[PDB]
Write a protein that binds this DNA or RNA. Structure first.
Ligand SMILES: NC(=[NH2+])NCCC[C@H](N)C(=O)O
Ligand SMILES: [Mg+2]
Ligand SMILES: [Mg+2]
Ligand SMILES: [Mg+2]
Ligand SMILES: [Mg+2]
Ligand SMILES: [Mg+2]
Ligand SMILES: [Mg+2]
Ligand SMILES: [Mg+2]
Ligand SMILES: [Mg+2]
Ligand SMILES: [Mg+2]
Ligand SMILES: [Mg+2]
Ligand SMILES: [Mg+2]
Ligand SMILES: [Mg+2]
Ligand SMILES: [Mg+2]
Ligand SMILES: [Mg+2]
Ligand SMILES: [Mg+2]
Ligand SMILES: [Mg+2]
Ligand SMILES: [Mg+2]
Ligand SMILES: [Mg+2]
Ligand SMILES: [Mg+2]
Ligand SMILES: [Mg+2]
Ligand SMILES: [Mg+2]
Ligand SMILES: [Mg+2]
Ligand SMILES: [Mg+2]
Ligand SMILES: [Mg+2]
Ligand SMILES: [Mg+2]
Ligand SMILES: [Mg+2]
Ligand SMILES: [Mg+2]
Ligand SMILES: [Mg+2]
Ligand SMILES: [Mg+2]
Ligand SMILES: [Mg+2]
Ligand SMILES: [Mg+2]
Ligand SMILES: [Mg+2]
Ligand SMILES: [Mg+2]
Ligand SMILES: [Mg+2]
Ligand SMILES: [Mg+2]
Ligand SMILES: [Mg+2]
Ligand SMILES: [Mg+2]
Ligand SMILES: [Mg+2]
Ligand SMILES: [Mg+2]
Ligand SMILES: [Mg+2]
Ligand SMILES: [Mg+2]
Ligand SMILES: [Mg+2]
Ligand SMILES: [Mg+2]
Ligand SMILES: [Mg+2]
Ligand SMILES: [Mg+2]
Ligand SMILES: [Mg+2]
Ligand SMILES: [Mg+2]
Ligand SMILES: [Mg+2]
Ligand SMILES: [Mg+2]
Ligand SMILES: [Mg+2]
Ligand SMILES: [Mg+2]
Ligand SMILES: [Mg+2]
Ligand SMILES: [Mg+2]
Ligand SMILES: [Mg+2]
Ligand SMILES: [Mg+2]
Ligand SMILES: [Mg+2]
Ligand SMILES: [Mg+2]
Ligand SMILES: [Mg+2]
Ligand SMILES: [Mg+2]
Ligand SMILES: [Mg+2]
Ligand SMILES: [Mg+2]
Ligand SMILES: [Mg+2]
Ligand SMILES: [Mg+2]
Ligand SMILES: [Mg+2]
Ligand SMILES: [Mg+2]
Ligand SMILES: [Mg+2]
Ligand SMILES: [Mg+2]
Ligand SMILES: [Mg+2]
Ligand SMILES: [Mg+2]
Ligand SMILES: [Mg+2]
Ligand SMILES: [Mg+2]
Ligand SMILES: [Mg+2]
Ligand SMILES: [Mg+2]
Ligand SMILES: [Mg+2]
Ligand SMILES: [Mg+2]
Ligand SMILES: [Mg+2]
Ligand SMILES: [Mg+2]
Ligand SMILES: [Mg+2]
Ligand SMILES: [Mg+2]
Ligand SMILES: [Mg+2]
Ligand SMILES: [Mg+2]
Ligand SMILES: [Mg+2]
Ligand SMILES: [Mg+2]
Ligand SMILES: [Mg+2]
Ligand SMILES: [Mg+2]
Ligand SMILES: [Mg+2]
Ligand SMILES: [Mg+2]
Ligand SMILES: [Mg+2]
Ligand SMILES: [Mg+2]
Ligand SMILES: [Mg+2]
Ligand SMILES: [Mg+2]
Ligand SMILES: [Mg+2]
Ligand SMILES: [Mg+2]
Ligand SMILES: [Mg+2]
Ligand SMILES: [Mg+2]
Ligand SMILES: [Mg+2]
Ligand SMILES: [Mg+2]
Ligand SMILES: [Mg+2]
Ligand SMILES: [Mg+2]
Ligand SMILES: [Mg+2]
Ligand SMILES: [Mg+2]
Ligand SMILES: [Mg+2]
Ligand SMILES: [Mg+2]
Ligand SMILES: [Mg+2]
Ligand SMILES: [Mg+2]
Ligand SMILES: [Mg+2]
Ligand SMILES: [Mg+2]
Ligand SMILES: [Mg+2]
Ligand SMILES: [Mg+2]
Ligand SMILES: [Mg+2]
Ligand SMILES: [Mg+2]
Ligand SMILES: [Mg+2]
Ligand SMILES: [Mg+2]
Ligand SMILES: [Mg+2]
Ligand SMILES: [Mg+2]
Ligand SMILES: [Mg+2]
Ligand SMILES: [Mg+2]
Ligand SMILES: [Mg+2]
Ligand SMILES: [Mg+2]
Ligand SMILES: [Mg+2]
Ligand SMILES: [Mg+2]
Ligand SMILES: [Mg+2]
Ligand SMILES: [Mg+2]
Ligand SMILES: [Mg+2]
Ligand SMILES: [Mg+2]
Ligand SMILES: [Mg+2]
Ligand SMILES: [Mg+2]
Ligand SMILES: [Mg+2]
Ligand SMILES: [Mg+2]
Ligand SMILES: [Mg+2]
Ligand SMILES: [Mg+2]
Ligand SMILES: [Mg+2]
Ligand SMILES: [Mg+2]
Ligand SMILES: [Mg+2]
Ligand SMILES: [Mg+2]
Ligand SMILES: [Mg+2]
Ligand SMILES: [Mg+2]
Ligand SMILES: [Mg+2]
Ligand SMILES: [Mg+2]
Ligand SMILES: [Mg+2]
Ligand SMILES: [Mg+2]
Ligand SMILES: [Mg+2]
Ligand SMILES: [Mg+2]
Ligand SMILES: [Mg+2]
Ligand SMILES: [Mg+2]
Ligand SMILES: [Mg+2]
Ligand SMILES: [Mg+2]
Ligand SMILES: [Mg+2]
Ligand SMILES: [Mg+2]
Ligand SMILES: [Mg+2]
Ligand SMILES: [Mg+2]
Ligand SMILES: [Mg+2]
Ligand SMILES: [Mg+2]
Ligand SMILES: [Mg+2]
Ligand SMILES: [Mg+2]
Ligand SMILES: [Mg+2]
Ligand SMILES: [Mg+2]
Ligand SMILES: [Mg+2]
Ligand SMILES: [Mg+2]
Ligand SMILES: [Mg+2]
Ligand SMILES: [Mg+2]
Ligand SMILES: [Mg+2]
Ligand SMILES: [Mg+2]
Ligand SMILES: [Mg+2]
Ligand SMILES: [Mg+2]
Ligand SMILES: [Mg+2]
Ligand SMILES: [Mg+2]
Ligand SMILES: [Mg+2]
Ligand SMILES: [Mg+2]
Ligand SMILES: [Mg+2]
Ligand SMILES: [Mg+2]
Ligand SMILES: [Mg+2]
Ligand SMILES: [Mg+2]
Ligand SMILES: [Mg+2]
Ligand SMILES: [Mg+2]
Ligand SMILES: [Mg+2]
Ligand SMILES: [Mg+2]
Ligand SMILES: [Mg+2]
Ligand SMILES: [Mg+2]
Ligand SMILES: [Mg+2]
Ligand SMILES: [Mg+2]
Ligand SMILES: [Mg+2]
Ligand SMILES: [Mg+2]
Ligand SMILES: [Mg+2]
Ligand SMILES: [Mg+2]
Ligand SMILES: [Mg+2]
Ligand SMILES: [Mg+2]
Ligand SMILES: [Mg+2]
Ligand SMILES: [Mg+2]
Ligand SMILES: [Mg+2]
Ligand SMILES: [Mg+2]
Ligand SMILES: [Mg+2]
Ligand SMILES: [Mg+2]
Ligand SMILES: [Mg+2]
Ligand SMILES: [Mg+2]
Ligand SMILES: [Mg+2]
Ligand SMILES: [Mg+2]
Ligand SMILES: [Mg+2]
Ligand SMILES: [Mg+2]
Ligand SMILES: [Mg+2]
Ligand SMILES: [Mg+2]
Ligand SMILES: [Mg+2]
Ligand SMILES: [Mg+2]
Ligand SMILES: [Mg+2]
Ligand SMILES: [Mg+2]
Ligand SMILES: [Mg+2]
Ligand SMILES: [Mg+2]
Ligand SMILES: [Mg+2]
Ligand SMILES: [Mg+2]
Ligand SMILES: [Mg+2]
Ligand SMILES: [Mg+2]
Ligand SMILES: [Mg+2]
Ligand SMILES: [Mg+2]
Ligand SMILES: [Mg+2]
Ligand SMILES: [Mg+2]
Ligand SMILES: [Mg+2]
Ligand SMILES: [Mg+2]
Ligand SMILES: [Mg+2]
Ligand SMILES: [Mg+2]
Lengths: 59, 149, 202, 64
RNA sequence: GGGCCUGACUGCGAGGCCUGCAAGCCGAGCAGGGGCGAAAGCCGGGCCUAGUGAACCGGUGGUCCCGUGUGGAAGGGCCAU
RNA sequence: GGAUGACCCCAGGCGGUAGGGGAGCGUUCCCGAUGCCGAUGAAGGCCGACCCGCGAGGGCGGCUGGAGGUAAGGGAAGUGC
RNA sequence: GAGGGGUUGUGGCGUGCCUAUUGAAGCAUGAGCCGGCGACUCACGGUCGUGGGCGAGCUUAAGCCGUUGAGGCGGAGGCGUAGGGAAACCGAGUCCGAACAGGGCGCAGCGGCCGCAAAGUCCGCGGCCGUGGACCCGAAACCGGGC
RNA sequence: CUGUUGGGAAGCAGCGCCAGAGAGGGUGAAAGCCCCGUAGGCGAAAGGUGGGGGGAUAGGUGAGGGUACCCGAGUACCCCGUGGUUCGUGGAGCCAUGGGGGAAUCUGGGCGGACCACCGCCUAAGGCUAAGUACUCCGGGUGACCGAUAGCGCACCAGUAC
RNA sequence: GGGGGGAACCUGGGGAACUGAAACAUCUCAGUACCCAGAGGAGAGGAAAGAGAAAUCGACUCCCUGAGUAGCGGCGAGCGA
């Protein structure tokens, strides 16, 4: 199963490492969605910015 | 519910067609065979799938193609049966030849080759071969390809 | 889903067990058709014009007698000749699918559960092979011979006692089958046989 | 008894995935020196058989 | 009638004519490497319609696909004729 | 129309060989049947101007016959001259 | 016993039955008459159609155990799940090709996770085909061994 | 068991009884309890069988090191002519052999589809060997088998009369 | 000790033709029908100079399957491990 992640909340005012997790995810702009594999390495970063991101599991 | 209620559903048990049994039936006299030829006879015609009245036959005027083989016959060589990633969706943990012959996907005596139709899953998949596209998908999805010998 | 009565010393209990609620009559017809056809002997036979005892001699010349042309007297146009397409020894059996038999077995019992005709018993009190003994038990158990009963128990001593009654058909549970279930008006089983029955529909 | 595969058909013909019957075009076994390249090239390809004849051949191959 | 030439192409082939099948026929256009022309273009034989023969079996040139435990070889397959 | 083939109303079709389809009748046998019909008369036979069915047929009654027959609903064929 | 049965004088109309044929009452075939016997079946495989079971799966063969008109076990194997190529081989593609060109043959459920349906497959039934003598009867002949 | 109708009860009726027996066939008609049976049980002095149980007997039995003695002959092997196998001369091997030539004893020989090499498999030219398998003159059991033109050619004095 | 008999069954030694190929010769029918010798309640076969690719199996006989596969074939009809 894959992952469709949406950037819903702004990272402004959040620590530099959460800022980076979006760079690894590839999320750059608000409401932008990227479709990514459900790998535990990708999963650890999504669960990092989970409070700023909207995840739906399209398989 | 006792016996005398047991019935086949409508249409489940049709009567037979009996020929040569009178004018009123529709099938009397000539038994639906018409009149008086080789087809009308007990014994009938030459094989309708092939024979054509003496002329060279539609099948026999076509040319042969390709290796037909010789004695002592088939050459023993390894045989590959492919199964798609879509088929692996039902499994967890490990995937092997013997497991895919049990679920009824891979056939015995056949070496396992994975092909790329569908999505890959984070499974350890042990096969004799992989398609290039199944290889990429498997890596990129958290899966572990494991060749054999 | 069904509430199946149990006879006992300590209470006409109520055991539950999931039998199908949909009964498919045609499927039950298909099981009985199989049951009855696979028991056929297929010993009907006739003789062909090559199996008949006469010789292969032309009885009289083809032409110039004023009679019809004939070959040998074994031909099926003669009285005493062979018979055309007569019955030959046959096997009428065939492999009805297991899931059709198995589900037909659940359906047959479910049909008697709908009616209150299925009755289970813990044991049989004083019956030890004597018909008079089974008869007394049946009466206190509410089987007075007005309804035909399929008794299904592994107790040999209980099957011997009942088997000669005109209204009773005895079976060991391994022999439970839809024809005998549908043949009768009521179903009476051990708990040991009921357990066996559950182990055959799963 | 069980039907036998016609080997003459087996050696000339194939049943495709949707049930069509393909064979080699005829007419280039020999006498090709005065045949145009268009004639040789196109006679090098497979063709789908007309439906009546295909349905006859398929019956001869009951285990493909 | 003359000049230069070899398209009397290789790899394909949209769409059709004809038609019981199998055949037969016409074909723009794209690619390879060319010929003629300043060029627009033309050229996949010949003004056109006859000048022909399905398959099986075998020959020859190529290809290097198969090679009966393995490497070869025998013998096949494929392309051409 | 009414909900279903419950029946009714309206309109149209309904010559037929080869031949395609459909719906039925009857014969032998099995399940139903440890039943049921039967000496107050089984099957079969001979009548009938009677009833039901388009028809194949099925009843009913009289006579003969003297011991068998077998429903509703299904099953299988040595099934109709 | 306002109806019905039997009979048939007169009047009207009126070319047997079957087979074969372009066409028969036909002066074309068959049949004296009556009764009984008498011709489209079965096995295995195939192919459609159909009634059910299960469904990315479906199904067991021999046999084993039970029964004594009881059913069960048994997964060996078979069909299906992937095609294209003479093949090596590759694979949702592949083959021809120099081609990433063109072309052949291939690839993709209805509903509010459960229902409904469905590839497929198993069994029953039915039509037709193949193999058998294959709807029934009929030669003249051929061969074998004897008389 | 009794009564009743009837030529006859086993039919109908009253009241009973058995059942490890309600398979079936009889008895003047239609009988669980009348007869023969059926369920369940028992039975061989004599002959046959005895594949199972027991007991005899025949036969069965190491390790190194050395020696290179033996290991199935008109055989193997090759060639010619055939057969067998799925193999019809095919690239034609394998197993068999009518003709000709013709070895060796393990460092011997045959095979793995011409052939060669490599790698393996196997031990020819002496013999025997239960069980599982086939058939049905004979006996019994059982039929959605026939019912006297049917079923065997024969239900009967039939392989007869002719 | 042999001889001769025995319904089929079995082994061995010999061995057709109609037919099918819509003619026919190779091919088929078929090592079938039949003749002959022998066997016994069975007969044959049987303890690898096997199989053939599993770096494997492990006498023979018989059923199922593998499989109408592999192949054979005027590469026709068909035959068929
Ligand atoms: N245990 C049994 N097999 N019971 C079934 C009845 C057996 C026998 N057919 C009888 O009627 O008595
Ligand atoms: Mg903020
Ligand atoms: Mg940090
Ligand atoms: Mg039927
Ligand atoms: Mg009918
Ligand atoms: Mg039929
Ligand atoms: Mg019909
Ligand atoms: Mg007829
Ligand atoms: Mg009629
Ligand atoms: Mg019709
Ligand atoms: Mg008609
Ligand atoms: Mg007629
Ligand atoms: Mg017809
Ligand atoms: Mg028809
Ligand atoms: Mg017809
Ligand atoms: Mg006719
Ligand atoms: Mg005509
Ligand atoms: Mg005609
Ligand atoms: Mg006629
Ligand atoms: Mg005609
Ligand atoms: Mg005709
Ligand atoms: Mg006719
Ligand atoms: Mg005729
Ligand atoms: Mg005939
Ligand atoms: Mg004919
Ligand atoms: Mg092949
Ligand atoms: Mg071989
Ligand atoms: Mg029968
Ligand atoms: Mg029969
Ligand atoms: Mg007969
Ligand atoms: Mg007979
Ligand atoms: Mg005869
Ligand atoms: Mg005869
Ligand atoms: Mg005779
Ligand atoms: Mg005879
Ligand atoms: Mg005689
Ligand atoms: Mg004769
Ligand atoms: Mg004759
Ligand atoms: Mg004779
Ligand atoms: Mg004769
Ligand atoms: Mg004459
Ligand atoms: Mg005369
Ligand atoms: Mg006469
Ligand atoms: Mg006559
Ligand atoms: Mg005559
Ligand atoms: Mg005759
Ligand atoms: Mg005769
Ligand atoms: Mg007879
Ligand atoms: Mg007779
Ligand atoms: Mg007859
Ligand atoms: Mg016949
Ligand atoms: Mg006949
Ligand atoms: Mg028959
Ligand atoms: Mg039989
Ligand atoms: Mg059938
Ligand atoms: Mg069967
Ligand atoms: Mg009873
Ligand atoms: Mg009863
Ligand atoms: Mg019973
Ligand atoms: Mg009984
Ligand atoms: Mg061929
Ligand atoms: Mg050609
Ligand atoms: Mg040619
Ligand atoms: Mg060529
Ligand atoms: Mg050539
Ligand atoms: Mg030219
Ligand atoms: Mg050209
Ligand atoms: Mg050219
Ligand atoms: Mg080319
Ligand atoms: Mg197959
Ligand atoms: Mg396939
Ligand atoms: Mg010029
Ligand atoms: Mg130049
Ligand atoms: Mg076109
Ligand atoms: Mg055309
Ligand atoms: Mg160009
Ligand atoms: Mg250019
Ligand atoms: Mg140019
Ligand atoms: Mg230039
Ligand atoms: Mg230019
Ligand atoms: Mg052009
Ligand atoms: Mg010209
Ligand atoms: Mg010119
Ligand atoms: Mg031409
Ligand atoms: Mg030929
Ligand atoms: Mg050739
Ligand atoms: Mg190579
Ligand atoms: Mg190589
Ligand atoms: Mg090799
Ligand atoms: Mg080398
Ligand atoms: Mg070399
Ligand atoms: Mg060649
Ligand atoms: Mg070569
Ligand atoms: Mg070559
Ligand atoms: Mg190539
Ligand atoms: Mg060519
Ligand atoms: Mg009209
Ligand atoms: Mg009409
Ligand atoms: Mg209709
Ligand atoms: Mg009827
Ligand atoms: Mg009738
Ligand atoms: Mg009967
Ligand atoms: Mg009865
Ligand atoms: Mg009765
Ligand atoms: Mg009465
Ligand atoms: Mg009386
Ligand atoms: Mg009377
Ligand atoms: Mg009768
Ligand atoms: Mg009447
Ligand atoms: Mg009287
Ligand atoms: Mg009467
Ligand atoms: Mg009687
Ligand atoms: Mg009657
Ligand atoms: Mg009846
Ligand atoms: Mg009925
Ligand atoms: Mg029934
Ligand atoms: Mg008949
Ligand atoms: Mg009058
Ligand atoms: Mg008038
Ligand atoms: Mg008149
Ligand atoms: Mg008129
Ligand atoms: Mg007249
Ligand atoms: Mg007239
Ligand atoms: Mg008439
Ligand atoms: Mg005529
Ligand atoms: Mg005429
Ligand atoms: Mg006249
Ligand atoms: Mg006249
Ligand atoms: Mg006249
Ligand atoms: Mg005349
Ligand atoms: Mg006349
Ligand atoms: Mg005539
Ligand atoms: Mg006639
Ligand atoms: Mg006469
Ligand atoms: Mg008369
Ligand atoms: Mg008559
Ligand atoms: Mg038919
Ligand atoms: Mg059949
Ligand atoms: Mg069918
Ligand atoms: Mg079907
Ligand atoms: Mg099922
Ligand atoms: Mg299953
Ligand atoms: Mg292929
Ligand atoms: Mg393509
Ligand atoms: Mg395409
Ligand atoms: Mg469904
Ligand atoms: Mg289905
Ligand atoms: Mg058909
Ligand atoms: Mg035959
Ligand atoms: Mg026939
Ligand atoms: Mg037929
Ligand atoms: Mg003569
Ligand atoms: Mg001859
Ligand atoms: Mg001759
Ligand atoms: Mg002659
Ligand atoms: Mg002679
Ligand atoms: Mg009296
Ligand atoms: Mg009395
Ligand atoms: Mg009994
Ligand atoms: Mg009785
Ligand atoms: Mg009796
Ligand atoms: Mg009675
Ligand atoms: Mg009775
Ligand atoms: Mg009695
Ligand atoms: Mg006993
Ligand atoms: Mg006894
Ligand atoms: Mg030593
Ligand atoms: Mg030595
Ligand atoms: Mg030796
Ligand atoms: Mg010697
Ligand atoms: Mg030789
Ligand atoms: Mg040879
Ligand atoms: Mg040979
Ligand atoms: Mg060859
Ligand atoms: Mg050979
Ligand atoms: Mg020799
Ligand atoms: Mg050695
Ligand atoms: Mg050596
Ligand atoms: Mg040797
Ligand atoms: Mg050798
Ligand atoms: Mg070898
Ligand atoms: Mg060798
Ligand atoms: Mg080799
Ligand atoms: Mg070996
Ligand atoms: Mg023993
Ligand atoms: Mg023995
Ligand atoms: Mg034995
Ligand atoms: Mg007997
Ligand atoms: Mg009788
Ligand atoms: Mg008589
Ligand atoms: Mg007789
Ligand atoms: Mg009589
Ligand atoms: Mg007799
Ligand atoms: Mg007779
Ligand atoms: Mg006499
Ligand atoms: Mg002697
Ligand atoms: Mg003797
Ligand atoms: Mg003797
Ligand atoms: Mg022999
Ligand atoms: Mg001898
Ligand atoms: Mg011989
Ligand atoms: Mg001779
Ligand atoms: Mg011949
Ligand atoms: Mg034929
Ligand atoms: Mg034949
Ligand atoms: Mg012929
Ligand atoms: Mg012919
Ligand atoms: Mg001739
Ligand atoms: Mg011939
Ligand atoms: Mg032969
Ligand atoms: Mg042969
Ligand atoms: Mg012989
Ligand atoms: Mg014989
Ligand atoms: Mg003897
Ligand atoms: Mg024995
Ligand atoms: Mg022996
Ligand atoms: Mg021996
Ligand atoms: Mg030995
Ligand atoms: Mg297979
Ligand atoms: Mg198969």
């Amino acid at each position: 199963p894959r992952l469709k992640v949406k950037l819903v909340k702004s990272p402004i005012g959040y620590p530099k490492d959460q800022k980076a997790a979006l760079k690894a995810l590839g999320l750059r702009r608000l409401q932008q969605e990227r479709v990514l594999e459900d790998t535990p390495a990708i999963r650890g970063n999504v669960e990092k910015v989970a409070h700023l991101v909207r995840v739906e599991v399209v398989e | 519910m006792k016996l005398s209620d047991l019935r086949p559903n409508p249409g489940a048990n049709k009567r037979r067609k009996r020929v040569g049994r009178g004018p009123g039936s529709g099938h009397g006299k000539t038994a639906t065979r018409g009149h008086k030829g080789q087809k009308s006879r007990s014994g009938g015609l030459k094989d309708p799938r092939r024979f054509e009245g003496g002329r060279s036959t539609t099948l026999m005027r076509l040319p042969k193609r390709g290796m037909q083989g010789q004695v002592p016959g088939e050459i023993k060589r390894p045989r590959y049966q492919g199964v798609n990633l879509k088929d692996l969706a039902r499994f967890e943990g490990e995937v092997t030849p013997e497991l895919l012959v049990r679920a009824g996907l891979l056939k015995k005596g056949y070496r396992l080759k994975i092909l790329g139709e569908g999505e890959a899953k984070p499974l350890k998949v042990v096969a004799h071969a992989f398609s290039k596209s199944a290889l990429e998908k498997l890596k990129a999805a958290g899966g572990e390809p494991v060749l054999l010998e | 889903v069904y509430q199946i009565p149990v006879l006992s010393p300590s209470g006409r209990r109520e055991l539950a067990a999931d039998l199908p609620a949909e009964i498919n009559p045609h499927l039950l017809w298909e099981v009985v058709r199989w049951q009855l056809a696979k028991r056929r002997r297929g010993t009907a036979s006739t003789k062909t014009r090559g199996e008949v005892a006469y010789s292969g001699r032309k009885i009289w010349p083809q032409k110039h007698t004023g009679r019809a042309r004939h070959g040998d007297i074994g031909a099926p146009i003669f009285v005493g000749g062979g018979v055309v397409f007569g019955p030959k020894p046959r096997d009428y059996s065939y492999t009805l699918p297991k899931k059709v038999r198995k589900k037909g077995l659940a359906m047959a019992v479910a049909d008697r559960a709908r009616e209150g005709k299925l009755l289970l018993v813990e044991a049989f009190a004083g019956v030890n092979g004597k018909t008079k003994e089974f008869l007394a038990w049946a009466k206190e158990a509410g089987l007075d011979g007005s309804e035909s009963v399929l008794l299904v128990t592994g107790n040999e001593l209980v099957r011997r006692a009942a088997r000669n009654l005109p209204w009773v058909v005895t079976l060991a549970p391994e022999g439970l089958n839809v024809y005998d279930i549908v043949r009768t008006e009521r179903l009476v089983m051990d708990l040991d046989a009921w357990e066996v029955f559950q182990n055959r529909i799963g | 008894p069980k039907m036998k595969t016609h080997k003459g058909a087996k050696k000339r013909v194939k049943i495709t995935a949707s049930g069509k019957v393909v064979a080699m075009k005829t007419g280039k076994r020999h006498l090709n020196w005065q045949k145009s390249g268009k004639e040789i090239r196109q006679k090098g390809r497979k063709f789908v058989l007309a439906k009546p004849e295909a349905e006859r051949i398929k019956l001869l191959l009951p285990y493909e």
